[PDB]
Design a protein around this motif. Structure first.
Motif, PDB file in Angstrom:
ATOM      1  N   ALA A  97       0.824  -1.204   0.000  1.00 25.18           N
ATOM      2  CA  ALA A  97       0.000   0.000   0.000  1.00 25.18           C
ATOM      3  C   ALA A  97       0.860   1.256   0.000  1.00 25.18           C
ATOM      4  CB  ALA A  97      -0.941  -0.007   1.203  1.00 25.18           C
ATOM      5  N   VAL A  98       1.939   1.259   0.784  1.00 22.94           N
ATOM      6  CA  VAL A  98       2.856   2.395   0.774  1.00 22.94           C
ATOM      7  C   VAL A  98       3.524   2.525  -0.588  1.00 22.94           C
ATOM      8  CG1 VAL A  98       4.915   3.379   1.827  1.00 22.94           C
ATOM      9  CG2 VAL A  98       3.198   2.269   3.256  1.00 22.94           C
ATOM     10  N   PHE A  99       3.903   1.394  -1.188  1.00 20.63           N
ATOM     11  CA  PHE A  99       4.584   1.419  -2.477  1.00 20.63           C
ATOM     12  C   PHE A  99       3.699   2.011  -3.566  1.00 20.63           C
ATOM     13  CE2 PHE A  99       5.530  -0.690  -6.534  1.00 20.63           C
ATOM     14  CZ  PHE A  99       6.836  -0.287  -6.716  1.00 20.63           C
ATOM     15  N   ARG A 100       2.418   1.637  -3.590  1.00 20.72           N
ATOM     16  CA  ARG A 100       1.535   2.141  -4.636  1.00 20.72           C
ATOM     17  C   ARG A 100       1.246   3.630  -4.490  1.00 20.72           C
ATOM     18  NH1 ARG A 100      -3.298  -1.938  -6.105  1.00 20.72           N
ATOM     19  NH2 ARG A 100      -4.249  -0.809  -4.348  1.00 20.72           N
ATOM     20  N   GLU A 101       1.462   4.204  -3.306  1.00 21.74           N
ATOM     21  CA  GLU A 101       1.276   5.637  -3.117  1.00 21.74           C
ATOM     22  C   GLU A 101       2.495   6.454  -3.521  1.00 21.74           C
ATOM     23  OE1 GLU A 101      -1.353   7.316  -2.410  1.00 21.74           O
ATOM     24  OE2 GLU A 101      -2.689   5.615  -2.045  1.00 21.74           O
ATOM     25  N   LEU A 102       3.606   5.805  -3.853  1.00 22.90           N
ATOM     26  CA  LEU A 102       4.808   6.516  -4.247  1.00 22.90           C
ATOM     27  C   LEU A 102       4.642   7.118  -5.640  1.00 22.90           C
ATOM     28  CD1 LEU A 102       7.525   3.996  -3.019  1.00 22.90           C
ATOM     29  CD2 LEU A 102       6.464   5.899  -1.792  1.00 22.90           C
ATOM     30  N   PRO A 103       5.439   8.129  -5.975  1.00 21.69           N
ATOM     31  CA  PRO A 103       5.434   8.652  -7.345  1.00 21.69           C
ATOM     32  C   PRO A 103       5.955   7.613  -8.326  1.00 21.69           C
ATOM     33  CG  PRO A 103       6.378  10.246  -5.828  1.00 21.69           C
ATOM     34  CD  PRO A 103       6.262   8.957  -5.077  1.00 21.69           C
ATOM     35  N   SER A 104       5.729   7.894  -9.612  1.00 19.45           N
ATOM     36  CA  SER A 104       6.122   6.953 -10.656  1.00 19.45           C
ATOM     37  C   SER A 104       7.630   6.741 -10.674  1.00 19.45           C
ATOM     38  CB  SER A 104       5.632   7.447 -12.016  1.00 19.45           C
ATOM     39  OG  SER A 104       4.220   7.556 -12.039  1.00 19.45           O
ATOM     40  N   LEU A 105       8.403   7.815 -10.498  1.00 19.66           N
ATOM     41  CA  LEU A 105       9.856   7.687 -10.487  1.00 19.66           C
ATOM     42  C   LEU A 105      10.336   6.900  -9.272  1.00 19.66           C
ATOM     43  CD1 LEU A 105      12.523   8.347 -11.807  1.00 19.66           C
ATOM     44  CD2 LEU A 105      12.538  10.528 -10.585  1.00 19.66           C
ATOM     45  N   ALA A 106       9.690   7.095  -8.121  1.00 20.55           N
ATOM     46  CA  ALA A 106      10.109   6.404  -6.905  1.00 20.55           C
ATOM     47  C   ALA A 106       9.914   4.897  -7.022  1.00 20.55           C
ATOM     48  CB  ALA A 106       9.345   6.951  -5.701  1.00 20.55           C
ATOM     49  N   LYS A 107       8.820   4.469  -7.658  1.00 19.64           N
ATOM     50  CA  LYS A 107       8.553   3.040  -7.792  1.00 19.64           C
ATOM     51  C   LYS A 107       9.656   2.342  -8.574  1.00 19.64           C
ATOM     52  CE  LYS A 107       3.541   3.771  -7.732  1.00 19.64           C
ATOM     53  NZ  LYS A 107       2.290   3.697  -8.532  1.00 19.64           N
ATOM     54  N   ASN A 108      10.141   2.974  -9.645  1.00 27.06           N
ATOM     55  CA  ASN A 108      11.224   2.384 -10.420  1.00 27.06           C
ATOM     56  C   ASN A 108      12.490   2.248  -9.585  1.00 27.06           C
ATOM     57  OD1 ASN A 108      13.786   3.369 -12.337  1.00 27.06           O
ATOM     58  ND2 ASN A 108      12.587   1.655 -13.152  1.00 27.06           N
ATOM     59  N   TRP A 109      12.806   3.265  -8.780  1.00 32.43           N
ATOM     60  CA  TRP A 109      13.974   3.182  -7.910  1.00 32.43           C
ATOM     61  C   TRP A 109      13.828   2.056  -6.898  1.00 32.43           C
ATOM     62  CZ3 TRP A 109      14.956   9.063  -6.568  1.00 32.43           C
ATOM     63  CH2 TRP A 109      15.458   9.691  -7.715  1.00 32.43           C
ATOM     64  N   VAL A 110      12.636   1.909  -6.316  1.00 32.74           N
ATOM     65  CA  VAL A 110      12.413   0.841  -5.345  1.00 32.74           C
ATOM     66  C   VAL A 110      12.571  -0.522  -6.005  1.00 32.74           C
ATOM     67  CG1 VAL A 110      10.733  -0.191  -3.788  1.00 32.74           C
ATOM     68  CG2 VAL A 110      10.965   2.291  -3.895  1.00 32.74           C
TER      69      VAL A 110
ATOM     70  N   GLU B 204      12.150  15.637  -5.377  1.00 33.07           N
ATOM     71  CA  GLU B 204      10.887  15.433  -4.676  1.00 33.07           C
ATOM     72  C   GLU B 204      10.704  13.969  -4.292  1.00 33.07           C
ATOM     73  OE1 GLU B 204       7.725  16.986  -7.033  1.00 33.07           O
ATOM     74  OE2 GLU B 204       8.439  19.059  -6.945  1.00 33.07           O
ATOM     75  N   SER B 205      11.021  13.056  -5.213  1.00 37.36           N
ATOM     76  CA  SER B 205      10.890  11.633  -4.921  1.00 37.36           C
ATOM     77  C   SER B 205      11.844  11.206  -3.812  1.00 37.36           C
ATOM     78  CB  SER B 205      11.136  10.813  -6.187  1.00 37.36           C
ATOM     79  OG  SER B 205      10.229  11.174  -7.212  1.00 37.36           O
ATOM     80  N   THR B 206      13.088  11.688  -3.854  1.00 34.64           N
ATOM     81  CA  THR B 206      14.049  11.348  -2.810  1.00 34.64           C
ATOM     82  C   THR B 206      13.600  11.879  -1.456  1.00 34.64           C
ATOM     83  OG1 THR B 206      15.819  11.402  -4.458  1.00 34.64           O
ATOM     84  CG2 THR B 206      16.459  11.463  -2.139  1.00 34.64           C
ATOM     85  N   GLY B 207      13.090  13.111  -1.423  1.00 28.45           N
ATOM     86  CA  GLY B 207      12.594  13.662  -0.174  1.00 28.45           C
ATOM     87  C   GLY B 207      11.411  12.888   0.374  1.00 28.45           C
ATOM     88  N   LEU B 208      10.488  12.486  -0.504  1.00 29.63           N
ATOM     89  CA  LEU B 208       9.346  11.697  -0.055  1.00 29.63           C
ATOM     90  C   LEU B 208       9.789  10.340   0.478  1.00 29.63           C
ATOM     91  CD1 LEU B 208       6.406  11.439   0.393  1.00 29.63           C
ATOM     92  CD2 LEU B 208       6.089  10.795  -1.995  1.00 29.63           C
ATOM     93  N   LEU B 209      10.743   9.696  -0.202  1.00 29.95           N
ATOM     94  CA  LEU B 209      11.251   8.414   0.276  1.00 29.95           C
ATOM     95  C   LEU B 209      11.933   8.561   1.629  1.00 29.95           C
ATOM     96  CD1 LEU B 209      12.721   6.784  -2.970  1.00 29.95           C
ATOM     97  CD2 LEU B 209      10.588   6.230  -1.791  1.00 29.95           C
ATOM     98  N   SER B 210      12.718   9.625   1.807  1.00 31.79           N
ATOM     99  CA  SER B 210      13.369   9.853   3.093  1.00 31.79           C
ATOM    100  C   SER B 210      12.345  10.118   4.189  1.00 31.79           C
ATOM    101  CB  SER B 210      14.354  11.017   2.982  1.00 31.79           C
ATOM    102  OG  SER B 210      15.021  11.238   4.213  1.00 31.79           O
ATOM    103  N   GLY B 211      11.308  10.898   3.882  1.00 27.77           N
ATOM    104  CA  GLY B 211      10.278  11.166   4.871  1.00 27.77           C
ATOM    105  C   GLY B 211       9.513   9.919   5.270  1.00 27.77           C
ATOM    106  N   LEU B 212       9.196   9.066   4.296  1.00 26.59           N
ATOM    107  CA  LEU B 212       8.532   7.803   4.587  1.00 26.59           C
ATOM    108  C   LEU B 212       9.481   6.755   5.149  1.00 26.59           C
ATOM    109  CD1 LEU B 212       6.101   7.484   1.544  1.00 26.59           C
ATOM    110  CD2 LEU B 212       5.713   8.476   3.807  1.00 26.59           C
ATOM    111  N   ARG B 213      10.784   7.041   5.178  1.00 27.17           N
ATOM    112  CA  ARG B 213      11.790   6.147   5.752  1.00 27.17           C
ATOM    113  C   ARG B 213      11.810   4.788   5.059  1.00 27.17           C
ATOM    114  NH1 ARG B 213      14.196   7.185  10.437  1.00 27.17           N
ATOM    115  NH2 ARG B 213      14.231   4.937  10.899  1.00 27.17           N
ATOM    116  N   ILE B 214      11.479   4.764   3.767  1.00 28.52           N
ATOM    117  CA  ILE B 214      11.582   3.528   2.998  1.00 28.52           C
ATOM    118  C   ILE B 214      13.038   3.097   2.886  1.00 28.52           C
ATOM    119  CG2 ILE B 214      11.246   2.518   0.722  1.00 28.52           C
ATOM    120  CD1 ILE B 214       8.688   4.007   0.458  1.00 28.52           C
TER     121      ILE B 214
END
Lengths: 66, 604, 434, 52
Positions: free
Chosen positions: C27-40, C69-79
């Motif tokens: 559920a957390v993964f699907r809420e990520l931006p499109s660029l973030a999902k590829n990095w994950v 923006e994607s890096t900041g969101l990932l850091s905030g979510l502590r993924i």
DNA sequence: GCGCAATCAGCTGTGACTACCT
DNA sequence: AGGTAGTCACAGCTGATTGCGCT
């Protein structure tokens, strides 16, 4: 010093308020101080009649389809 | 009937929603029809509703039609019978016909053919199949004056009697009140008394399918009935009249509004009817091309209804004209028929079929209802949206761009109220700048521009400021004609100004940009006519109004006819690149100087 | 407020505990931006951290803002967490627990999310999907009617208190029914999935008052989000605290259950949509709604004038007066436009945009009419003999943050009524000091 | 003069429908567009002089 | 001096503003 | 305590007058 309410609007409405002041349409000269072309200072005890006059002016030239 | 939210709810009235939604139609108890356009049966339902009811609004998704007595009279005039229309309405209802429409439809359709009006030997007669109805209307005081001398029994064969020729309008108005409407059917196939002419249109002027439908509805069972056909000015309107005149094959009389529309009709006849010039005559006191002994005559209003002394030649022409029958008397711009002197025109000439053509049937003073019995029922109402979807009508992008009131003008606008404020919002400097910017842009993109502007006093300084041609109106005949003629085929000049002159059917050339400023108050007819001068996004027209003034309300209340026709008026509040270039009234000095020259009227 | 905003404000320990459930990670993964999902996905099978510069070089320079923006969101979510890579560099590696749970949710492993379903065999009183949808719609309509206050809607007292806590309704006097506030109207105008998510966020915020574990509730909600419609699951395997939450969801219509003691529960369509047309709009300001329920009729009549009510149709007209009244009631024009767009009939979807621009522009212009005049109470100072004296007082007022309007040309200033006393005291002291 | 030109432009171009529209734009999306479909529809529905 | 075209008088249509009786 | 014939603006038309042109 003067205590009241600052009113900010377009110059057309400011001039409408000025006309109301000079024509005594509200019964008195309560529109005392003019500060800017788009800002005025009005005593707060009669903001209701000003709102009624503004609404009447607005919906007069509106032609409601109701 | 219930007013829980102030809305007339008819949930309990029509519950017949059997299975389940396949019928794209809704009926109303009092009367209304709602049609779903996004249906596979849209074309057939539209054809059925057109033949039985007139539209009240045609937006892109849900059309709304109204059921009226005259609409049902027109429907029963065509071969459609009561059983057929009732069973097909019940067929496509999806909710069930309320028991207030079936009774209404039956009552309207029962009394259609009982009373008929006929013309024979320059005499008007009223014939009824059932003799009882004559005694039914005998006690009516208004009818008794028509007969002279009292027409004791007028024993013929079917009971008929003569009526007073000049009082035909009164009996026409009375009959509908008596629930016995008159019908105007001309069986031109077999007359043997009227001298038919050899008019025959050339077999090269093809017509569009909607014109085919309108003509076919005009001639439903081999006879022609009086009616009104509403088509846009850009669309083919004169062609329909020419084809109708050719089919009638009788002596035709055409009535126009202006002294130049008669030349337009003559050109149309010479183009699409193959008629020798000897038979064609124009009677407008300009050349007098021997109208005596003619097949087709073209004239204008305000000349057949003179209450003053007439010219010697014109008097003899009128005397000759009022002594024979006319076939398919064609009226142009029928919307302005219900006038003080235009109504009596139909009573001053005798004709079998009266065909009226117009583009803007809307009019104030609610006198359009009188036109139902003055001429006949509204026969055809073209759908403008589908007409422009086929590409034969230019898709005009309507715009309603307003401009704020300048501070130097709004004070005077709110100061004065005794009719002196028209010039104030008419000559708004911001509106002037917007108009100048639009003119310059559409000249840079090379589009023909027509600027309509009433209050010609303002139009003077509006046009001379830009140094552009304009039509005051009381100038002359040659100057206006030459200006309009060189407007089209000249790259140097492509913008003209018209002051209420183009508010009729003229020969204005094709244009893509129309800008109207300070028109009449609520003249939906005027705005619709002005829009009609553009269509023929290929084109687009703008309307400039001044904020916080009566012009806003006027524009709001005058566009309802077009939104009923299906057009949408986008609001433009900012003009891109307004400050990119230099425009007039850039500084406040000339703006405040304008106050003196605009208050210099002092018409007291 | 969305899921990411709530997750960002949580403590790191709560986020770490949330990742222990495979459903939560998805559920957390699907809420990520499109660029973030590829990095994950790229870092899914990595056991060593990567340099920050190496990750940054993947995206082109022109799209660096989206990468940031994607890096900041990932850091905030502590993924993922920055790792002190040897040599002075900073290494980026995904959280081992989150990565393991994501791989389990994708590849497979461990036990199923639910205990079992065939232990009790087929359900004796099993329902159908249309029946479940009807039950959910009826429950939602009952809740929304209770928001209005009609006597036909009767719910639990706890639900009424929760609504009062949300600020939608207030009880001025005890015993008398509460009255819905303007925020209640705004919430009613909101879309149903948005309404469900807002209610769930309020429940999560107020759960600490009832002593319920936030992590367990979030994990169960995320598991319900991915549940298959029409398939039941075993109630057993949950704490008694989760039982109260399940009963509350059943009251809300998210989950169907025949009896409180029943061991089965059927997720509904609303529950699936918790993770995340009938109105025809015409250019002549007319709405044609294909609805029968009183809820939609009331919602439309809030901001429009009703004309006709056919048994399966509603014809209304959007007039200036009705929109003005609705705005005076507290509903903004943007909410009305969003509501009209959401309920748009499938036929209107062909048009681009779906809602005609003229109608939206007219609604927005009607919204601006009410607030044409701006009112700000204050005290005006105009008795400045010297230009220099005016500037000092203006600077002091700006320091106090009480200035409303200033005009240096005419030496005019306006201060707030609260700050008038302070400015007066300052002016008196300055004259005394002079 | 030059000052009169600026004063007139300030009075005209931002009299009624800018003192709120500009403020809303300052408090708006700011970032990129939602989708390319929105931009295409806006370009189709915009007038020729508003696209230059 | 005659003949053609320009000009005005009078009447009317269209739409809107305004002063006295149920 | 609430509604229509005059009046005004701006166009149209036709019915005369009325100064202008001359190989």
């Amino acid at each position: 010093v003067l205590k009241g309410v600052l009113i900010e609007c377009d110059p057309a409405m400011k001039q409408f308020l000025l006309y109301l002041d000079e024509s005594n349409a509200l019964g008195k000269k309560f529109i005392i101080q003019d500060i800017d072309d788009t800002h005025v200072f009005v005593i707060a005890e009669l903001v209701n009649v000003l709102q009624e006059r503004v609404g009447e002016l607005m919906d007069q030239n509106a032609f409601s389809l109701t | 009937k219930v007013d829980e939210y102030g809305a007339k709810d008819y949930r309990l009235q029509m519950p017949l929603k059997d299975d389940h939604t396949s019928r794209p139609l809704w009926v109303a108890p009092d009367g209304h029809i709602f049609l779903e356009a996004f249906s596979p049966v849209y074309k057939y339902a539209q054809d059925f509703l057109v033949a039985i009811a007139e539209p009240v609004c045609r937006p892109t998704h849900v059309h709304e039609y109204k059921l009226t007595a005259y609409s049902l009279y027109a429907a029963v005039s065509v071969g459609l019978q009561t059983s057929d229309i009732t069973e097909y309405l019940r067929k496509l209802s999806k909710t069930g016909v309320p028991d207030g429409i079936m009774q209404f439809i039956k009552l309207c359709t029962v009394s259609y053919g009982k009373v008929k009006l006929v013309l024979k030997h320059n005499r008007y007669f009223v014939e009824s199949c059932h003799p009882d109805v004559i005694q039914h209307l005998l006690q009516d005081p208004v009818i008794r004056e028509c007969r002279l001398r009292n027409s004791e029994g007028e024993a013929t064969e079917t009971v008929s009697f003569e009526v007073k020729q000049e009082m035909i309008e009164e009996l026409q108005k009375r009959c509908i009140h008596l629930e016995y409407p008159l019908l105007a059917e001309y069986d031109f196939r077999n007359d043997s008394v009227n001298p038919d002419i050899n008019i025959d249109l050339k077999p090269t002027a093809v017509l569009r399918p909607y014109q085919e439908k309108s003509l076919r509805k005009m001639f439903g069972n081999g006879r022609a009935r009086s009616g009104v056909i509403v088509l846009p000015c850009g669309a083919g309107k004169s062609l329909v009249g020419v084809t109708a005149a050719c089919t009638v094959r009788k002596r035709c009389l055409v009535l126009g509004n202006s002294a130049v529309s008669v030349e337009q009709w003559k050109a149309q006849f010479k183009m699409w009817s193959t008629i020798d010039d000897s038979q064609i005559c124009r009677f407008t006191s300009d050349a007098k091309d021997k109208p005596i002994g003619c097949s087709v005559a073209i004239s204008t209003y305000s000349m057949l209804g003179h209450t003053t002394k007439r010219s010697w030649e014109a008097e003899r022409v009128m005397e000759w004209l009022k002594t024979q029958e006319w076939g398919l008397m064609i009226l142009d711009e029928v919307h302005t028929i219900p006038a003080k002197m235009f109504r009596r025109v139909l009573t001053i000439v005798q004709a079998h079929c009266k065909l009226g053509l117009t583009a803007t049937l809307v009019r104030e003073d609610d006198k359009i209802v009188d036109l139902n019995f003055l001429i006949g029922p509204k026969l055809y109402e073209a759908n403008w949206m589908e007409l422009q979807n086929n590409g034969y009508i230019a898709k005009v992008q309507c715009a309603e761009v307003w401009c704020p009131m300048s501070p130097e003008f709004y004070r005077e606008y709110v100061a004065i109220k005794t009719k002196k404020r028209i010039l104030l919002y008419t000559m708004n400097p911001n509106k002037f700048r917007a108009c100048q910017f639009l003119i310059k842009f559409h000249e840079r993109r090379n589009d023909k521009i027509i600027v309509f502007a009433d209050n010609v006093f303002a139009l003077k300084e509006y046009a001379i400021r830009l140094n552009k041609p304009y039509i005051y109106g009381p100038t002359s005949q040659g100057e206006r004609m030459q200006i309009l003629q060189n407007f089209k085929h000249n790259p140097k000049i492509n913008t003209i100004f018209i002051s209420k002159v183009g508010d009729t059917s003229f020969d204005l050339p094709e244009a893509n940009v129309l800008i109207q400023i300070s028109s009449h108050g609520g003249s939906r007819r005027q705005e619709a006519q002005r829009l009609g001068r553009v269509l023929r996004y290929n084109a687009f027209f703008y309307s400039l109004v001044s904020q916080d003034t009566q012009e806003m309300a006027y524009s709001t209340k005058r566009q309802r006819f077009l939104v009923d026709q299906g057009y949408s008026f986008k609001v433009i509040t900012k003009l891109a690149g307004m400050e990119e270039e230099d425009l007039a009234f850039s500084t406040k000095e000339e703006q405040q100087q304008l106050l003196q020259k605009v208050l210099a009227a002092t018409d007291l | 407020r969305n899921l990411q905003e709530f997750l960002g404000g949580l403590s790191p320990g709560v986020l770490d505990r949330l990742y222990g459930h495979p459903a939560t990670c998805l559920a957390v993964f699907r809420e990520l931006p499109s660029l973030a999902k590829n990095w994950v996905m790229r870092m899914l099978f990595l056991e060593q951290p990567l340099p920050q510069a190496a990750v940054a070089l993947w995206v082109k320079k022109e799209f660096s803002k989206a990468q940031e923006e994607s890096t900041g969101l990932l850091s905030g979510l502590r993924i993922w967490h920055t790792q002190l890579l040897p040599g002075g560099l900073q290494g980026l590696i995904l959280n081992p627990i989150f990565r393991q749970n994501l791989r389990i949710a994708l590849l497979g492993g461990g036990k199923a999310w639910s205990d079992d379903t065939s232990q009790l065999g087929p359900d004796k009183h099993a329902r159908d999907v249309p029946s479940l949808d009807k039950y959910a719609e009826e429950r939602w309509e009952v809740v929304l009617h209770f928001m209005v206050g009609s006597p036909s809607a009767a719910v639990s007292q706890d639900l009424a208190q929760l609504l009062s806590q949300a600020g939608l309704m207030k009880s001025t006097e005890p015993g008398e029914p509460p009255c819905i506030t303007s925020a209640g109207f705004q919430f009613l105008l909101l879309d149903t999935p948005a309404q469900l998510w807002y209610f769930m966020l309020q429940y999560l915020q107020t759960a600490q008052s009832r002593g319920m574990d936030l992590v367990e509730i979030l994990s169960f909600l995320f598991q319900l989000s991915f549940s298959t419609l029409g398939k039941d699951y075993s109630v057993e395997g949950m704490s008694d605290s989760l039982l109260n939450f399940l009963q509350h969801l059943r009251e809300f219509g998210l989950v169907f259950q025949r009896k409180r003691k029943s061991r089965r529960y059927y997720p509904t369509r609303l529950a699936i949509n918790l993770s995340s047309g009938f109105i025809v709009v015409e250019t002549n300001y007319r709405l044609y709604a294909y609805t029968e329920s009183e809820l939609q009729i009331a919602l439309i009549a809030l901001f429009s004038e009703m004309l006709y009510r056919f048994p399966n149709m509603v014809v209304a007209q959007v007039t200036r007066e009705s929109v003005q009244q609705a705005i005076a009631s507290g509903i903004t024009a943007q909410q009305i436009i969003h509501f009209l767009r959401t309920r748009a009939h499938p036929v209107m979807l062909k048009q681009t945009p779906v809602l005609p621009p003229t109608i939206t522009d007219q609604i927005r212009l009607w919204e601006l009419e009410r607030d044409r005049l701006r009112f700000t109470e204050g005290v005006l100072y105009n008795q400045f003999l010297s230009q220099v004296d005016f500037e000092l007082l203006l600077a002091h007022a700006r320091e106090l943050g009480v200035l409303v309007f200033e005009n240096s040309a005419k030496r005019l200033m306006v201060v707030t009524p609260a700050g008038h006393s302070d400015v007066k005291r300052f002016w008196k002291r300055q004259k005394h000091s002079s | 003069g030059t000052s009169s030109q600026a004063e007139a432009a300030r009075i005209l171009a931002a009299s009624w429908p800018q003192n709120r529209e500009d403020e809303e734009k300052q408090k708006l999306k700011g970032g990129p567009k939602k989708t390319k479909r929105e931009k295409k529809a806006a370009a189709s529905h915009l007038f020729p002089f508003e696209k230059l």
